[PDB]
mmCIF file of C-alpha atoms and ligand atoms in Angstrom:
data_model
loop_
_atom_site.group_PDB
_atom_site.id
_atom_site.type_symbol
_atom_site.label_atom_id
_atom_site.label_comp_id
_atom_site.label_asym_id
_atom_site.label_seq_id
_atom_site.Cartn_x
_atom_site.Cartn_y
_atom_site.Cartn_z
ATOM 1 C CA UNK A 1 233.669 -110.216 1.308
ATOM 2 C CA UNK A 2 230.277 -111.179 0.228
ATOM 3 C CA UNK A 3 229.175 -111.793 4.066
ATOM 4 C CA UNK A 4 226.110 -109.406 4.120
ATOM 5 C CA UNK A 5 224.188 -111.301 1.809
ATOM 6 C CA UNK A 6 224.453 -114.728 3.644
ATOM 7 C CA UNK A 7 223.117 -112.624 7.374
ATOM 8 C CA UNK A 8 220.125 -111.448 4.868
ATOM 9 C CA UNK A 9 219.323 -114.830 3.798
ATOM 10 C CA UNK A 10 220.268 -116.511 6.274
ATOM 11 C CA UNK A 11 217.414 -116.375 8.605
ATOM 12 C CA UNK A 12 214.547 -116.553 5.561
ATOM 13 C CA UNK A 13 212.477 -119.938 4.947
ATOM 14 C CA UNK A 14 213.829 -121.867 1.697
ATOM 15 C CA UNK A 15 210.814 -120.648 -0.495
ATOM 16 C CA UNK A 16 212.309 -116.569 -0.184
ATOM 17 C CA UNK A 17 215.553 -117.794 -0.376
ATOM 18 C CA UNK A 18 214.956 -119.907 -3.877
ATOM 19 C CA UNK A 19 213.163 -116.366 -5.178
ATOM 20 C CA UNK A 20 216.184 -114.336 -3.581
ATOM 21 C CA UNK A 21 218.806 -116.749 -4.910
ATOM 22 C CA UNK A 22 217.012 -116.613 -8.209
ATOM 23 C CA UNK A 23 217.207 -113.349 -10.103
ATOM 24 C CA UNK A 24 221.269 -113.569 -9.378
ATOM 25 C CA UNK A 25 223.636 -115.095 -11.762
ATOM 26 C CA UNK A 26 224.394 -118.593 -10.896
ATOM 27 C CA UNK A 27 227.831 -118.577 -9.860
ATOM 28 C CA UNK A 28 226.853 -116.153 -7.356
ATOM 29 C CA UNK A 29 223.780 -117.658 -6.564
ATOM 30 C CA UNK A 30 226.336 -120.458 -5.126
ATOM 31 C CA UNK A 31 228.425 -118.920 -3.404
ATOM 32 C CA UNK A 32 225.729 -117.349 -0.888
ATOM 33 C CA UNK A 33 224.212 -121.200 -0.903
ATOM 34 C CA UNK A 34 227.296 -122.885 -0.125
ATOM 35 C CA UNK A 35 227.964 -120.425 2.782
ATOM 36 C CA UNK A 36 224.066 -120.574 4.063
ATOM 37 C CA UNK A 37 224.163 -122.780 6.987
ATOM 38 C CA UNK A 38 224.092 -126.385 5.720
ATOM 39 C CA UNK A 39 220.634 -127.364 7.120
ATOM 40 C CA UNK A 40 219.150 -125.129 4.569
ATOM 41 C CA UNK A 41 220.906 -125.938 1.918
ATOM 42 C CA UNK A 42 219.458 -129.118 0.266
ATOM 43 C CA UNK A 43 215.872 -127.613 0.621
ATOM 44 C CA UNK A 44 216.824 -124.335 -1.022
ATOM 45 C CA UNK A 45 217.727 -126.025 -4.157
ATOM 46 C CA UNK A 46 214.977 -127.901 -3.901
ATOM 47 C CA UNK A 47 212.703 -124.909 -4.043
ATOM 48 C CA UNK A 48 214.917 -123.413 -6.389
ATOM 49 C CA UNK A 49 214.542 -126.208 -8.772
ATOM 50 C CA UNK A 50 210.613 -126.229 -8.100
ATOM 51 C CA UNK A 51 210.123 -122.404 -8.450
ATOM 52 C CA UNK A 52 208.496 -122.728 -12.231
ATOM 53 C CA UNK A 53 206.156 -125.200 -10.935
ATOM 54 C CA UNK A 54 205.017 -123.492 -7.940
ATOM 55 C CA UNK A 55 205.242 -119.948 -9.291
ATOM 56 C CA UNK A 56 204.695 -117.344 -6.757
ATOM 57 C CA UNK A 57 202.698 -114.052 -7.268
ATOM 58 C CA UNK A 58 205.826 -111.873 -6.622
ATOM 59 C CA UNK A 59 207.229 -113.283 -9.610
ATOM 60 C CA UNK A 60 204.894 -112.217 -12.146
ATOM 61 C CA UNK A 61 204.437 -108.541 -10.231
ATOM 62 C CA UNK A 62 207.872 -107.953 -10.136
ATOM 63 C CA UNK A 63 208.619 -108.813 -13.988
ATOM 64 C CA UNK A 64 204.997 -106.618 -14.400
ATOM 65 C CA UNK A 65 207.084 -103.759 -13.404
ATOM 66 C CA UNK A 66 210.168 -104.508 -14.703
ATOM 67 C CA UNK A 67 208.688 -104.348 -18.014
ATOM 68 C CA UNK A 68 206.666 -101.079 -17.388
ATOM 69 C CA UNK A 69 210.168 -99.705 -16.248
ATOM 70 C CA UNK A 70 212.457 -100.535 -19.466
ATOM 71 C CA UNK A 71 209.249 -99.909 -21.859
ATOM 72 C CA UNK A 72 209.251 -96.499 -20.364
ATOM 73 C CA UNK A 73 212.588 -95.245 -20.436
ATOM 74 C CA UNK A 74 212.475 -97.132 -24.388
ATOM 75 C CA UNK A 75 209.541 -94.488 -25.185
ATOM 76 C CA UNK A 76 211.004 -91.659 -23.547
ATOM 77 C CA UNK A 77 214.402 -91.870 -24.844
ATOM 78 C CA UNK A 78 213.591 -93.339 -28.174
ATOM 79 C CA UNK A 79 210.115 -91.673 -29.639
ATOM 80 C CA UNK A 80 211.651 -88.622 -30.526
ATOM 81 C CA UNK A 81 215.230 -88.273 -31.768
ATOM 82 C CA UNK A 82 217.605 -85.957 -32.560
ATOM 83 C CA UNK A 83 217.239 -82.441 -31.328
ATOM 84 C CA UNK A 84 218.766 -79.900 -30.041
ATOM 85 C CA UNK A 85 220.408 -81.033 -27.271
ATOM 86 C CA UNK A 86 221.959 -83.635 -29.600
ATOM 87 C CA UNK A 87 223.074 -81.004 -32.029
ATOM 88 C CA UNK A 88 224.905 -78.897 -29.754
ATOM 89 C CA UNK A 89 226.396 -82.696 -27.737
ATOM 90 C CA UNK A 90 227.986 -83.366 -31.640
ATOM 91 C CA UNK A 91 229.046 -79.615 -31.830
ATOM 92 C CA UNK A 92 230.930 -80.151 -28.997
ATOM 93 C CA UNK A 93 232.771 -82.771 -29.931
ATOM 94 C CA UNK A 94 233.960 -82.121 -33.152
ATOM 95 C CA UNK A 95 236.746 -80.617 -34.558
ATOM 96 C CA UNK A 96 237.041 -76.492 -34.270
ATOM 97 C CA UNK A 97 237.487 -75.685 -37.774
ATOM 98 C CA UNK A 98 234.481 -78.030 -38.956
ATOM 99 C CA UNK A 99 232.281 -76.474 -35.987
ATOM 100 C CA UNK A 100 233.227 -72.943 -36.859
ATOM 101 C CA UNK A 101 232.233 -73.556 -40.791
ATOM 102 C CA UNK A 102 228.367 -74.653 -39.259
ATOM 103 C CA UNK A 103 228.328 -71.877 -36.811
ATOM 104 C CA UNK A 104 229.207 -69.579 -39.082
ATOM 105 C CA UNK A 105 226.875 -70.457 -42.062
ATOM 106 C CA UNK A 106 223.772 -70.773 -38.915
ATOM 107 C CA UNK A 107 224.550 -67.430 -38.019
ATOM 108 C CA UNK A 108 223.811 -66.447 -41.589
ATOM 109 C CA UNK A 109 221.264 -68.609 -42.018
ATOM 110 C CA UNK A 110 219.093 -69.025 -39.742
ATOM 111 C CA UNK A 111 220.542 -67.042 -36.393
ATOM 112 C CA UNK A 112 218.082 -68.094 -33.612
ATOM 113 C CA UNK A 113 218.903 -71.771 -34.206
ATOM 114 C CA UNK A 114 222.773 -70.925 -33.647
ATOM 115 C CA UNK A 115 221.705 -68.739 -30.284
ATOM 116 C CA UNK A 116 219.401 -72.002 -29.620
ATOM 117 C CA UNK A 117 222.170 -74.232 -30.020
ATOM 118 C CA UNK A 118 225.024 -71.608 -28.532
ATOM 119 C CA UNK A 119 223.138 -72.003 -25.294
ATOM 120 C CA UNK A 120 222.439 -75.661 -25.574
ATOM 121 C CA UNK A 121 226.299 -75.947 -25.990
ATOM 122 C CA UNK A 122 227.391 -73.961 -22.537
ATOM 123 C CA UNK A 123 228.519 -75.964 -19.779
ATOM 124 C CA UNK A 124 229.788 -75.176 -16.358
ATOM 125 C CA UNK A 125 233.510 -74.459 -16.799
ATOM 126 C CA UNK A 126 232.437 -71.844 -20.231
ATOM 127 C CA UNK A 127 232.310 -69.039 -17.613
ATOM 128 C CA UNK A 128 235.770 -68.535 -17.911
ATOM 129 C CA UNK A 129 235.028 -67.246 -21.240
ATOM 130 C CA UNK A 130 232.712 -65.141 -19.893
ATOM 131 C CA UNK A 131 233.403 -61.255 -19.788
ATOM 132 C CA UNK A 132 233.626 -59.454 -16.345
ATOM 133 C CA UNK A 133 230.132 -57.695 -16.990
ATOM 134 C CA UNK A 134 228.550 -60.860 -17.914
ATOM 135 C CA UNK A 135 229.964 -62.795 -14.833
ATOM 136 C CA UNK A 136 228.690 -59.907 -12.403
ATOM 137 C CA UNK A 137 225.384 -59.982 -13.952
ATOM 138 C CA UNK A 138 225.153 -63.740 -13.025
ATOM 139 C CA UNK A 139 225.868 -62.824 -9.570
ATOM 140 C CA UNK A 140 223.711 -60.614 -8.657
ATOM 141 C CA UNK A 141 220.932 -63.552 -9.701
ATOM 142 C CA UNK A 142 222.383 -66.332 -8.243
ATOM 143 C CA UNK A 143 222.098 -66.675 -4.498
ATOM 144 C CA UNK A 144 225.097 -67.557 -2.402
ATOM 145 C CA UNK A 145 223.700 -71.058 -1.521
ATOM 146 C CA UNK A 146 223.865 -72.213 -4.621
ATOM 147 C CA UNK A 147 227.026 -70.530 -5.901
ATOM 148 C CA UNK A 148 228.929 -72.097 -2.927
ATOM 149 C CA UNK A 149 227.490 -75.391 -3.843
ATOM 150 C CA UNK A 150 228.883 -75.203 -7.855
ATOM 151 C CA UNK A 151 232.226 -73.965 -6.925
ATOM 152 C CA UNK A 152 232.679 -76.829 -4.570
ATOM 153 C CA UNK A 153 233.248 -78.314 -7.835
ATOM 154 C CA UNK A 154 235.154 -76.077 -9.722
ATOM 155 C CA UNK A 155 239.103 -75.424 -10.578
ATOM 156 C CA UNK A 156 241.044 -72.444 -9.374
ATOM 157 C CA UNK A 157 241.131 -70.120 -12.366
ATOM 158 C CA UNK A 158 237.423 -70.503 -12.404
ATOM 159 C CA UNK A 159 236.881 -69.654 -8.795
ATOM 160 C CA UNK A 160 239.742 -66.500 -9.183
ATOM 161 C CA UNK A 161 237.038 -65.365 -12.244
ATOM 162 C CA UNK A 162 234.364 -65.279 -9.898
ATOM 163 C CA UNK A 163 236.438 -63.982 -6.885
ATOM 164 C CA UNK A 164 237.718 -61.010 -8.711
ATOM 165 C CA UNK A 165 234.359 -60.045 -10.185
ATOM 166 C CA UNK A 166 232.835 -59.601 -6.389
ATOM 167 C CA UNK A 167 233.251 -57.314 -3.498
ATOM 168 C CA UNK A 168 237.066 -57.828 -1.818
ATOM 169 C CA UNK A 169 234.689 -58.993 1.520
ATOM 170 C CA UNK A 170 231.882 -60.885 -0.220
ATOM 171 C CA UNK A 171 235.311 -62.825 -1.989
ATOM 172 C CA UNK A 172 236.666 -63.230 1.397
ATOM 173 C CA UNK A 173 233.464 -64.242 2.722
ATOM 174 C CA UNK A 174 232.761 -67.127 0.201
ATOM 175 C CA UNK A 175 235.907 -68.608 0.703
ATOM 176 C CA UNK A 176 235.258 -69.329 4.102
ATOM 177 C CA UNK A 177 231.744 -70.774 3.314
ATOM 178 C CA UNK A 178 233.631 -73.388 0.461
ATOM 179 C CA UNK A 179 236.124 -73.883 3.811
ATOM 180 C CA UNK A 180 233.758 -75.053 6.250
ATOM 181 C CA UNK A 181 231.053 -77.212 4.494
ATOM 182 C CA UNK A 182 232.782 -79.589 3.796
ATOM 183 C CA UNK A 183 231.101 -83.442 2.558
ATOM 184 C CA UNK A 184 228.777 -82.477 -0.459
ATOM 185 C CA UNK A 185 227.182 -85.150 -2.934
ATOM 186 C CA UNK A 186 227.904 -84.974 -6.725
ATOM 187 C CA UNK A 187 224.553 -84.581 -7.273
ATOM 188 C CA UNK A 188 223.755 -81.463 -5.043
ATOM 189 C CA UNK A 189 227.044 -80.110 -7.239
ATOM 190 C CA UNK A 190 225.371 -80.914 -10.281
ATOM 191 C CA UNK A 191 222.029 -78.955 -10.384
ATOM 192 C CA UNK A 192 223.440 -75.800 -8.528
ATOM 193 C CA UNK A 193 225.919 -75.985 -11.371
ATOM 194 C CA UNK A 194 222.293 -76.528 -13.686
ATOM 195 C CA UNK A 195 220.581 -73.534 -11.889
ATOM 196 C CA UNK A 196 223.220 -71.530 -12.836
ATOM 197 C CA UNK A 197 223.702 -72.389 -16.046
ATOM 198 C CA UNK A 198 220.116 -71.740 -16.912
ATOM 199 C CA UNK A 199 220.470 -68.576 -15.265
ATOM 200 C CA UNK A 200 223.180 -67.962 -18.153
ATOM 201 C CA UNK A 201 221.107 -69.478 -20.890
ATOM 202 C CA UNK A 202 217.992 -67.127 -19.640
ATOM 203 C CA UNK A 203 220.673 -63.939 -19.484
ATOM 204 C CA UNK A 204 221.929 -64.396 -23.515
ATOM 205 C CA UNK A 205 217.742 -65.474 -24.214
ATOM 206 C CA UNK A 206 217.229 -62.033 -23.177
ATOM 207 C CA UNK A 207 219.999 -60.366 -25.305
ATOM 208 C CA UNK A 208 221.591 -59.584 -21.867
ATOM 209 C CA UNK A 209 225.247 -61.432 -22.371
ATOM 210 C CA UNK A 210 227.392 -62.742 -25.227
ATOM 211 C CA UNK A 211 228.248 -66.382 -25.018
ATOM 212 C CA UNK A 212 231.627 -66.336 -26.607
ATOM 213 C CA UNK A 213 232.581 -69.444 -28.803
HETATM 214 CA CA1 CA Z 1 215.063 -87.232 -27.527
HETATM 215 CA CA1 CA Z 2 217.831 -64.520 -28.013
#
């Protein structure tokens, strides 16, 4: 059911149309013409087949900033490589024993690149291996807005860990919160997850908590 796009053409002039029908791939660019009502067809292709000749402003403006757009994300992503976030990404996935052989000669080595990349490493669900102590210093730092929020997206045992490491009312109490607000977005998940992770990464900076490994 493509129907949506033929009401939003449908009552444009042929010259919008042609530029609308244009940055689509051609099959599809057919199917919304051959369902446009059948006065407007002909002249649409017309002005479809005309558009290099004519050439309208928006053209050029809108390729002006599609190129600032790509070259952009190209320089950000691409003029530095490497780092630490990709160390600790490759850490992750690769096999225990060969990760435990380059932890182990970094925390010889040179130790506050292995802290660097410990933290870099932690994700959400690593606060299962967190101790008790550690989890209930994380608490009292986090606010209950944005602990409701991560959970939301978060397995049982890793709830139970932070459950059993509050008071027996503040436990009951945050249950009922996770009950009854219901729709969240992914996204709202994913930086109360990120504010407390930092707040974990700033706890170990400060010598506070062990990240276990
Ligand atoms: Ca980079
Ligand atoms: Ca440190």
């Amino acid at each position: 059911d493509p129907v949506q796009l033929v009401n939003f053409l449908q009552s444009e002039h042929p010259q919008t149309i042609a530029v609308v029908l244009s940055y689509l791939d051609p099959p599809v660019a057919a199917q919304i013409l051959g369902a446009l009502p059948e006065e407007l067809q002909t002249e649409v292709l017309k002005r479809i087949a005309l558009l290099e000749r004519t050439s309208p402003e928006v053209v050029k403006e809108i390729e002006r900033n599609l190129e600032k757009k790509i070259s952009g994300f190209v320089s950000r992503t691409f003029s530095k490589v490497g780092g630490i976030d990709t160390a600790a990404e490759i850490m992750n996935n690769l096999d225990r024993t060969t990760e435990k052989k380059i932890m182990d000669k970094l925390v010889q080595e040179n130790p506050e690149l292995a802290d660097e990349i410990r933290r870099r490493m932690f994700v959400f669900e690593d606060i299962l291996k967190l101790d008790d102590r550690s989890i209930q210093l994380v608490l009292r730092e986090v606010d209950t807005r944005d602990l409701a929020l991560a959970l939301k997206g978060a397995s049982d045992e890793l709830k139970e860990k932070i459950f059993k490491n509050m008071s027996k009312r503040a436990a009951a109490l945050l249950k009922d919160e996770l009950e009854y607000m219901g729709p969240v977005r992914l996204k709202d998940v994913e930086e109360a997850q990120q504010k407390i992770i930092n707040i974990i990464r700033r706890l170990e900076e400060a010598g506070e908590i062990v990240i276990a490994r």
